[PDB]
Amino acid sequence: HLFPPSLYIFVIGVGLPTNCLALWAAYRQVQQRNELGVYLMNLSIADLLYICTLPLWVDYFLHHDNWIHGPGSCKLFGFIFYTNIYISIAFLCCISVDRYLAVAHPLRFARLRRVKTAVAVSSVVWATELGANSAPLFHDELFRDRYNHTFCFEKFPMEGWVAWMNLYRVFVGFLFPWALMLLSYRGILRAVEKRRADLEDNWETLNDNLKVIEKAVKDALTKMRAAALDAQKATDKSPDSPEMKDFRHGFDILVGQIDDALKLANEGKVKEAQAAAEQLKTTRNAYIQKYLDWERERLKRLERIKRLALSLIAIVLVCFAPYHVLLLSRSAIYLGRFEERVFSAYHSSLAFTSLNCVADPILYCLVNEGARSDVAKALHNL
């Protein structure tokens, strides 16, 4: 075969030091109360668990004719295999969903972004998955109907009782969480742009009505007040931080100034209402730089979120889609009447999914920004 051994040797040699460092970094992120540290820690643990058994396989392909270890060794490798294959999908999905909640509903779902909750979610995911794939251990009939005990591969022919289970495993274990990841990504872009659908309308309302007041007053001020109030609501769509406290304050000042201009417009003093409206320029000019600095710290944060969502989609598509396509085709090729090309490609493609164990740790450079910190550490070590 040659290719499988080469890929597996590469995955062990790179993935083990890499996953050990990634696990340490995830722990450090958890200690900092970064909710994404738990999912990354669970992925790193699932990976280290998977990798530690792979050398026996590799040895089988490199130096031995058959499975000298006995049938007992195929049950655990397979189980472990399927575990690694799915757990990493379930956690990549959990990460994408968490990020969408963090962007689309920052306050209504704040209770779901605590570390304790992420831990409970991890516990539920592990117990549910491990249970779902635990049956072949309880009973053997399956394990024998699906595998040739003399070599840890699945029978070239397949029987029912599993012919449909493989479809269940592709529709629920792949298409479902993948569609959820794509939907999460779309939802993030829509919420963000829609966050570009409310403030620009408010800024234009305020700026153009002010232009009207200076040339024309009650009507323009009435519209400005409504826009100013909605701009505060936008401030409150985000969690508290000193800049949000300051923007709400700035708006209370702006609204009060609009009200003084209205008082004068109601009295009927156009010149005075206009002079009062001009103080809205003095006020907005006090917050322009703050707003601009604040948005830059946003565009970069959104860039990181979008890149993470896209990277997760690309990881699932490249590492797992080839097997789920060949597995679905292989099952489909049996629901009735080339055969050998499907097998050959499927078995080569089964080695490919082991690359998830190398791509995963890369996510640490996207989640936080301690990537730069680690680079500095390495430079210092040098």
């Epitope: 009435t222 519209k223 409504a226 109030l229 609501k233 209370d252 609204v255 009060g256």
Partner: antibody
């Protein structure tokens, strides 16, 4: 206890006048804006007048401009609505209501407290 | 000048039934719409303020929301005590206060 208590309604002939009162308890008149809301028999609610004694700001619905005067005297914790030159169309129940000042919840919460209302009937 | 229009001027519903009252602003109004419940002979009581939040003391049966200029009041399950006239009110400014015409919830028969 938070109360708004209206008084001074009754029967007036067209062209005549009434002085309605709105006494406050719990809160002072100067602590909030007072509004009069009118409800003609069988009709929905109409805003009529506003006073903010903390700023000296008043306003009126177009239907009563130059006809009604709104004032308040915080030393008795009481507000008043002076209704001059009344027309038949001014028959209604007049309610006094409390709406606080911007910023914050006292403003977003609008007419949280209403008084009992008093009937003004204008008829020859 | 900021008119509010309530659509279901009369709504019939059973006790335990779901009631939705829709109100439309003529122009943009921030979430500054309140809902009031008036029973015959009584001053209106505030139910919902800021087009969302309940006023303390108001049953959880009541809720509402804003979608652009469209505001709604929902009674998740009518109780015998909820057959009242509901009013939609706009509060952008002290002098601009307007009310919708009111919608009456009647007992279905």
């Amino acid at each position: 206890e938070v109360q708004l208590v209206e008084s001074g309604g009754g029967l007036v002939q067209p062209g005549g006048s009434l002085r309605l009162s709105c006494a406050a308890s719990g809160f002072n008149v100067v602590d909030f804006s007072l509004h009069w809301v009118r409800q003609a028999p069988g009709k929905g609610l109409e805003w009529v007048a506003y006073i903010s004694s903390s700023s000296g700001s008043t306003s009126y619905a177009d239907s009563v401009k130059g006809r009604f005067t709104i004032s308040a005297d915080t030393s008795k914790n009481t507000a008043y609505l002076q209704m001059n030159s009344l027309r038949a169309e001014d028959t209604a129940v007049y309610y006094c209501a409390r709406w606080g000042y911007w910023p914050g919840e006292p403003w977003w919460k609008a007419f949280d407290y209403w008084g009992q209302g008093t009937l003004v009937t204008v008829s020859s | 000048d900021i008119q509010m229009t309530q659509s279901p001027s009369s709504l019939s519903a059973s006790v335990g039934d779901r009631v939705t009252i829709t109100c439309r602003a003529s122009q943009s109004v921030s979430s500054a719409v309140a809902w009031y419940q008036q029973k015959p002979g009584k001053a209106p009581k505030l139910l919902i303020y800021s087009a969302s939040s309940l006023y303390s003391g108001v049953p959880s049966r009541f809720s509402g929301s804003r979608s652009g200029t469209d505001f709604t009041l929902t009674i998740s399950s009518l109780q015998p005590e909820d057959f009242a006239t509901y009013y939609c009110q706009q509060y952008l400014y002290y002098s601009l206060v307007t009310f919708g015409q009111g919608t009456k919830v009647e007992i279905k028969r």
